[PDB]
Symmetry: C2
Subunit: 231 residues, 2 copies
Amino acid sequence: LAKYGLPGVAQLRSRESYVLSYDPRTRGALWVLEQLRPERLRGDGDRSAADFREDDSVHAYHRATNADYRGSGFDRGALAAAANHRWSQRAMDDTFYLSNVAPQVPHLNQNAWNNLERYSRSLTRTYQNVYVCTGPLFLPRTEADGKSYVKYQVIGKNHVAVPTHFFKVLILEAAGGQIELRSYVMPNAPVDETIPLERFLVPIESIERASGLLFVPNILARAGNLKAITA
Amino acid sequence: TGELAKYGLPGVAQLRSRESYVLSYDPRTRGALWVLEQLRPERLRGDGDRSAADFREDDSVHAYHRATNADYRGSGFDRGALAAAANHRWSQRAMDDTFYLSNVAPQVPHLNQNAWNNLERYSRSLTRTYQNVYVCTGPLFLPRTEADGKSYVKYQVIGKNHVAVPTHFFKVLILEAAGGQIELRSYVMPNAPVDETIPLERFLVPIESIERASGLLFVPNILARAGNLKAI
C-alpha cells in the first residue's frame, strides 16, 4: 500500500538548544524540549544578533515566514527562549528559527509569559537540572447551547496558527534524583502581570488530554515517583 | 549537562497498519490525519457475504486521545469511515478493521450517505479501468475570513473527549494504468449536506491545494517512484 509513500511523517528536529516536534498543518511546533542548567544561563551580550529565520528544512508549503507575522499584531514568541542558552552563541541563534516560534499577543510575550520564563530560569539555582517543555494549545469553548468549538486565528499567506493558549511543563530534577512536576497554562491574551505564577498551574493530565501528548508515563518510568505541584 | 531526552519525547508519530489500510493518527484532534488504501478490482467481492462488525474504539490509542462511540452518540454526526467498508469486501477482517473509530471522522449524515458515498462508489468504479487504484483519504480544517477581516479556523468538537469535526474532507486517487503511468484526481467536499446531483468532477481541486492545507505531501512521493503525473 505504501508503494507511493506515506503522505506525512513525524517531523522531529534536533537543534543545539532544544528538540522539537513540528506540525505542518498548523505551521508550528507541537512541543519544544530544553534542558536548563545554571551554567547555561551565564554569558554576556557579546554579539546580540537576533533575527528570526524561517526553517529551511520545512517544506515551503508549511513553513512560517517573517512576512506571516509582520502586520499581524502578534509578536514572534520563541518557545525555547534565547535567554535560556546564553553560554552558547549557536544555542541562542537556533531559538530564532520560526519553527521554534508561535504567534503571541505582545503583552503576553513581553510580560506574563516572559516572567514565567524567568521563573523557570530562576529554578536553576535550586535544582541541578530544569527540563522545560513548551508548546501550543487549541482549547475549545462550550457555547450556551451545549455545542463546543475550537476557534483560532491564522495569520499571513501561510495560515500560521495562533494558539489559544500555551503550556510549559517543568521537570525539576533535584540533586538526589527526586523530581518535581510543574505544569503551567496561560491564555494567548494580555495576562495581568501581577497575578502570581502559582495561579496558572494546571494538572499535567489536563495538558496531556488537550495537547494529544503524554508526559507522566515517560516521567515515572525513570522517576519512580514524582511530586505533582498544585499550588 | 546530561541528555536532553532523559524523560520522554512527548510526541511520537502514530502509524497504524491494518489489513485493509495504513493510517497515521493525530491524538490532538482524536482523528486520523490520512488513510491509505489500495483498491483492486477483485478486491470488491461480487459474490460474497455481508458481515458488518460494530464500530469499536481503537484500544491501541491512549485513552486520553481515543475516540469512543459515546463521543459520537448524540452528536448528530455519522461515524464516517475514511477507508470505506465496501472497499474491502474480499476479507471479513479487512472490512472489520474499517470499523475501528481511528478510521472514523464525524461526518454530516447527508454527506456520508449521499455525496461522499457516491464518491466512494465512483472511486470503486475506476477499479475496472486501472491496474490499481490507490486512495488516500483524510480530514481538512480550512479557515474562513470573517467580517473583521481576519481568517479563522473554527470547527466543532463532540463528546466528552472533544473529538474534532473536520470542516472538509479530501480524497486523493492515485490511478495506476497499464503503462504504469499515474493520473491524479483529488477531491474535496465540505462536511455539509452536499447536493447529490452536483457532478463529482466539480469537486476536483489541484493537489497543491490539498498538500498546502492538509500539511501533507503527495507529489514528491509519487515522483519518487514514478517519473511524471498528469493534470489536476
